[PDB]
RNA sequence: UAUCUGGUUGAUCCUGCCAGUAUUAUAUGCUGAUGUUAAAGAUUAAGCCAUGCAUGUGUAAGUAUACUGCGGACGGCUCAUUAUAACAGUAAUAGUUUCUUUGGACAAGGAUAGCUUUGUGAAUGAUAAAGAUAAUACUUGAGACAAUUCAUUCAAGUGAGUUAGGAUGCCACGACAAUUGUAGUAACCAAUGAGAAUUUCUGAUCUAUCAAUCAGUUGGUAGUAUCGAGGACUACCAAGAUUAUAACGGAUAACGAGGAAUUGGGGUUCGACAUCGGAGAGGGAGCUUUACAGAUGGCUACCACUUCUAAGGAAGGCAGCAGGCGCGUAAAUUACCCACUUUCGAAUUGAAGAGGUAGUGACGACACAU
RNA sequence: AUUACUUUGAAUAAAAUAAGGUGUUUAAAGCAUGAAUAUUCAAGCAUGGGACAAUGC
């Protein structure tokens, strides 16, 4: 550690670098949204996985779990107004 | 050695059985700092002594231009591959040449 | 490199006479080989007094000084010698400091006293001496 | 000086300790002041935290006690007779706690064991068997 | 370290001091005084964080040095005076007074004090010691040494002190029929009624306290500060009364 | 009883000299042999002024060859996180054995308690002992 | 994203490894429009240093036609040492403890400064002596106990005390400035003090081409020493302590913890460096002042270095901030200011290369021209 | 009768890990009400149960 100010990353490169089943679909979103490069596609993919895991961890417990009710209600509430 | 209270045999077995790999063992023997001409360095600076040409292996043919370089930190002799076509002319005698590994690890 | 006229000092060091090394050059003992300015005679061994430049080989010390011939100056000797003002004095042991022909001392310090006869002869030695007896 | 730390000793298994740091001042130690016989001479040493210890080298008068009659009158001590800590302490006539001494019962009538720390308290006290 | 430590780094400060992490490298070190290092709030932070009177800490010196702030029965002139428990705090130059109090959300809250109720302050008996000369006296929570107290007092009771006269007014015993407010860790900021105390001869004494609404919480004996005897409140409790809301009306309420 | 060079005298001595025995604390009983005994000890928890603090362990007495001091053995366990399995271990502690317990022998369960440093390695006192079996080695203190 | 692919053969099915792959942290080639944030002499050398700065302080309340008081024992830098040592969680001090802060004779005796008076050296924060001159510098003085030491007693809350306290006999220091404005002192009790220091339990990499190890060593008695317990040391006594559950020894390119990189679960690698604790100021060693230093921007001696010189001598420790040489694959300006945070002070003001701004900066992070 | 096991609590540095809230224009940021913020692996303290377990009368 070197600096007190926190930092984070947003996009992670896909593992397989060259696929024709992923190159074609990238321009079906780049051309449609008028995106500049492929950075944005990775960034939303981080976003979906940001909450997809959160939904999966708290889905394994009972419906009466106090943490499931606490964070779950906030998780659904945050994702409804968005 | 599956028993619940036998957590010493299993740990001791793994400590013993881990020394037989050819890759991690290189990371604990003191030979990188001793026998490796590079050591733990990315690049090695040296001095040119001799120009040599190594013929290729059996299936191939031709002479690969190379130079025998003596380092400045260890003094050992290592053969270096001149990079490009006709690039043996660019190198001279008694000049600083950077030496940095190859594709295969170490 | 000497500056002055040495008086008469009864020489007590012969050929192959081990002396210590008051210097700090990583040499311990220097066995005398010759003496500079020695007017020799038949069957006579070279004699070194106090303040006499010698030529000595180092038989004990650091590797870059061992097994080589150096030039030293005797700073104290165990042989009683009489000053001109009627003083009869002698030291505790022999010693000598490594110098060069110009007199420039090779070391930077001297351990123990230095005889007066060897201090005014070489002004580069008197400065380093703790005391000058 | 004399350090009372445990970094120069060995372990319980006989292994030798390995050094990490130099001596620390919080491990002070002063040479013993064997309180011998003689004229009154007590020094003052400055201990840690500014407190002062009455360091005694030689004293001849000690304030004694004897509980069977509850009288405490000081008297001069003749010489040390027997010591339970060391035998060579008898001849040197040093004053240490738990040392049998002989006295003159001049103010006790008109064998003493010391029960003070003359090297630290600066004074000699005792009682009668 | 060779001796005492003077500079307190920002992060090493107790978390209930409302301090940031990027503001600066150091935090004001509370001096020796009536309360502990981590049990206090330095007077410099009170007048710059809770009160917002000064833009920076330089102007705090231009306030305390003027003999402006009065604490307890005296008036101080120390910038970083250690302000801990519910000792009164009066600033006549602004006609307003406060009181340093804990809250259920693990912080230091300031409840305003009127001029009529700033004349006295509560103190907690820490130990009863038979001093020399057969003179018993009791050490209070604020470190106050007092003269001959009531002989009926124990070492774990509470004494109603007055500032000007400096005499004991009323005493409330430590028994099963009283009420207390906590100063501990998780339990601090919680008020309730003691219901049961279990004594362990080994290390500690553990006491069970029930909240007003029926909530029951457990804490150590060292955390107990009795506020009254028989569910009666002898001082102005904070805005939240010191109840522990079960987090149902915090996540949902803050939405609107 | 009185066999050494110095006059072995008890720290708290009072003329009727009376035997000073103070009652112990956390639910232990004072041994009967310690009241009518003629022994003397300057570090005994009962007849002297050494207090037993919060720490208290137990084990099996291993050696009884040391004067007024014994060695206890504690065969505890350690959980290795990776392997989910426990590996047996041991630790030997020297505890000061008061001469109140005369039937204490090797292989007897003993309750120990902390106190001030009595020596370089000894920092505990014996509080009670329980008898066990025998192995032809009836070695007492 | 719980993922594979090319390579032994004419061809097939396996073990098997090489290479490919993605990511973090170092260096480098090529290119490089912006805004915000930000690493940056550690790896090899805890190697050597020219220079400049980094610890000083005056309110009406000490002395006025510099002395005295406090601080430099904090801050800051580096990671050499270090393998149950340190460190982390925890427990004890009924085995010790300060500094600062908060609660309890209408006036004595003196000479040492400032300024000179005559100077000596090439200099060293160089030093001589002659005249006075004040104290909140030093003694006294008195206006009146407290607290320690020793032998003996009355004996309670306390988990637990011949204990806090009281009473004896007795020794010792012995007070409440001879104190200032037109606050200041002596002690004694308690808190700050979950602090500082010791100490209880548990926990550490590889190695058996380390299998037996220890003689102050294991414990007891009695003393000494230290603020304080104890072989910490001393004199006597007995032979005891660890050991296959890895003792003793060896290596580290080993400061430890909080944590970091990467993970389906499990795990592996790293951590000098934000914060806490530890150690060190070229190398040990010995001490001064003081409440705390074994202080090194304090002293001394030795080993190795550096600087001026009138050749008689003098001081210095950049592993502080910039900067210089070497080392290397490898790393920034010989800048300005106490404005933000904080610390020190004779205390609202004075100081801080702590701290902030500026400068280089493709280590990295976010939005983004063409 | 201890210990282990298991359920609970107490106390448990901050920074940080995942975040509760909060349009630095979004975001990286920051805490401008301070999420109960959960954190403590290894140990230790008190506690409900004794099926599986180790200790010998």
Swiss-Prot record, chain A:
Family: Belongs to the universal ribosomal protein uS4 family.
Protein name in UniProt: Small ribosomal subunit protein uS4
Part of the whole protein covered: 2 to 83 of 185
């Amino acid at each position: 550690g070197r600096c007190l100010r926190n930092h984070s990353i947003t996009y992670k490169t896909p593992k397989v670098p060259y696929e024709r089943e992923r190159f074609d679909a990238e321009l079906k979103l780049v051309g449609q949204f008028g995106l500049k490069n492929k950075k944005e596609i990775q960034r939303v993919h981080y976003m979906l996985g940001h909450m997809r895991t959160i939904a999966k961890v708290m889905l394994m417990k009972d419906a009466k779990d106090p943490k499931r009710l606490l964070e779950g209600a906030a998780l659904l509430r945050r994702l409804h107004n968005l | 050695a599956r028993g619940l209270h036998a957590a010493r045999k299993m740990l001791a077995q793994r400590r013993a059985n881990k020394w037989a790999d050819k890759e991690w063992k290189k990371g604990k023997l003191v030979t990188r700092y001793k026998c490796n001409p590079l050591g733990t360095a990315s690049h090695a600076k040296g001095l040119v002594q001799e120009k040599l040409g190594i013929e290729t292996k059996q299936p191939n043919s031709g002479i690969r231009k190379c130079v025998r370089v003596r380092l400045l930190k260890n003094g050992k002799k290592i053969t270096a591959f001149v990079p490009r076509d006709g690039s043996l002319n660019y190198v001279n005698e008694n000049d600083e040449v950077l030496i940095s590994g190859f594709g295969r690890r170490g | 490199g000497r500056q002055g006229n040495k008086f008469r000092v009864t020489c007590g060091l012969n050929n192959a006479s081990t002396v210590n090394c008051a210097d700090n050059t990583g040499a311990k003992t220097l066995t005398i080989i010759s003496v500079k300015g020695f007017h020799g005679r038949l069957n006579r061994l070279p004699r070194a007094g106090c303040g006499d430049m010698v030529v000595a080989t180092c038989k004990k010390g650091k590797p870059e000084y061992r097994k080589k011939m150096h030039t030293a100056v005797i700073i104290r000797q165990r042989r009683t010698w009489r000053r001109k003002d009627g003083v009869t004095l002698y030291f505790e042991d022999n010693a000598a400091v490594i110098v060069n022909m110009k007199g420039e001392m090779k070391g930077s310090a001297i351990t123990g006293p230095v005889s007066k006869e060897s201090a005014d002869l070489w002004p580069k030695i008197s400065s380093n001496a703790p005391t000058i007896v | 000086g004399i350090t009372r730390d445990s970094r120069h000793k060995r372990r319980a298994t006989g292994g030798k300790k390995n050094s990490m740091q130099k001596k620390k001042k919080n491990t002070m130690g002063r040479q013993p002041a064997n309180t011998r016989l003689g004229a009154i001479r007590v020094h003052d040493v400055r201990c840690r935290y500014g407190i002062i210890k009455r360091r005694a080298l030689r004293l001849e008068n000690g304030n004694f006690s004897w509980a069977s009659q509850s009288i405490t009158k000081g008297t001069k001590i003749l010489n040390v007779v027997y010591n339970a800590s060391d035998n060579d302490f008898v001849r040197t006539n040093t004053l240490v706690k738990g040392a049998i001494i002989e006295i003159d019962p001049a103010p006790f009538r008109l064998l003493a064991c010391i029960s003070s720390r003359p090297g630290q308290t600066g004074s000699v006290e005792g009682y009668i068997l | 370290a060779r001796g005492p430590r003077h500079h307190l780094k920002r992060l090493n400060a107790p978390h209930h001091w409302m301090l940031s992490k990027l503001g600066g490298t150091f935090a004001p070190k509370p001096s020796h005084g009536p309360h502990g290092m981590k049990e206090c709030l330095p007077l410099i932070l009170i007048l710059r964080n809770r009160l917002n009177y000064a833009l920076n800490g330089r102007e705090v010196t231009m306030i305390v040095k003027n003999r402006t702030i009065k604490i307890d029965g005296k008036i101080r002139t120390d910038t970083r005076y250690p302000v801990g428990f519910m000792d009164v705090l009066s600033i006549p130059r602004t006609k307003e007074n406060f009181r340093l109090m804990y809250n259920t959300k693990r912080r230091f809250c300031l409840v305003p004090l009127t001029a009529e109720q700033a004349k006295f302050k509560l103190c907690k008996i820490e130990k009863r010691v038979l001093g020399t000369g057969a003179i018993p006296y009791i050490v209070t929570h604020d470190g106050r040494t007092i003269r001959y107290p009531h002989p009926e007092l124990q070492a774990n009771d509470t004494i109603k002190l007055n500032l000007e006269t400096g005499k004991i007014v009323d005493f409330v015993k430590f028994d099963i029929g009283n009420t207390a407010m906590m100063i501990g860790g998780n339990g601090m900021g919680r008020v309730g009624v003691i219901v049961k105390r279990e004594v362990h001869p080994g290390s500690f004494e553990i006491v069970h306290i029930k909240d007003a609404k029926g909530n029951t919480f457990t804490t150590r004996l060292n955390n107990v500060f009795v506020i009254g005897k028989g569910t009666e409140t002898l001082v102005n409790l904070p805005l939240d009364k010191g109840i522990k809301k079960p987090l149902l009306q915090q996540v949902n309420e803050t939405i609107k | 009883e009185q066999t050494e060079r110095a006059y072995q005298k008890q720290v708290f001595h009072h003329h009727s000299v009376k035997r000073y025995h103070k009652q112990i604390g956390m639910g232990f009983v004072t041994p009967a042999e310690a009241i009518k005994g003629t022994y003397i000890d300057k570090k005994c928890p009962f007849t002297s002024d050494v207090s037993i603090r919060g720490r208290t362990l137990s084990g099996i007495v291993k050696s009884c060859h040391m004067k007024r001091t014994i060695i206890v053995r504690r065969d505890y366990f350690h959980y290795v996180s990776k392997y989910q399995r426990y590996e047996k271990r041991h630790k030997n502690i020297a505890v000061h054995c008061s001469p109140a317990f005369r039937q204490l022998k090797e292989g007897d369960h003993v309750v120990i308690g902390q106190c001030r440093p009595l020596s370089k390695t000894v920092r505990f006192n014996v509080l009670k002992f329980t008898s066990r079996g025998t192995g032809d080695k009836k070695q007492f203190a």
